[PDB]
């Protein structure tokens, strides 16, 4: 039998984010 | 692609058939961060300015 | 069964080498 992943169990708003932030790149390693 | 803390220096000129930039990075970070015997090496050119002498 | 060699576990910056050497050709064997 295989499971289908059943639930997390707590919820909140969704808010899929209005107020935007500039997204700078990180790909800084090492130089 | 930048960031907001780069402080471009800016130094026009008049009679300059192209544009060349300089880019340094400055360490700044505060763990160890010491620089080696500022290369003096045959093998290796320094960094600072490059002058690349190379095919093979 | 096979493996897949699954891991090495020690991680580091990648730094694909930005400042060149000149590359000297070591074929000096006993000459």
């Known amino acids: ?31 | 692609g930048a960031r907001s803390d780069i402080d471009f220096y800016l130094q026009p000129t008049l009679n300059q058939k192209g544009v060349v930039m300089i880019a340094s990075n400055y360490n700044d970070n505060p763990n160890s961060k010491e620089k080696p015997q500022t290369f003096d090496v045959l093998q290796g050119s320094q960094p600072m300015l490059g002058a690349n002498t190379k095919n093979l």
């Open chain 1, 1 to 31: 039998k295989k499971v289908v992943k059943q639930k997390n169990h707590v919820y909140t708003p969704v808010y899929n984010e209005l107020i935007e932030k500039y997204s700078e790149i990180p790909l800084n390693d090492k130089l």
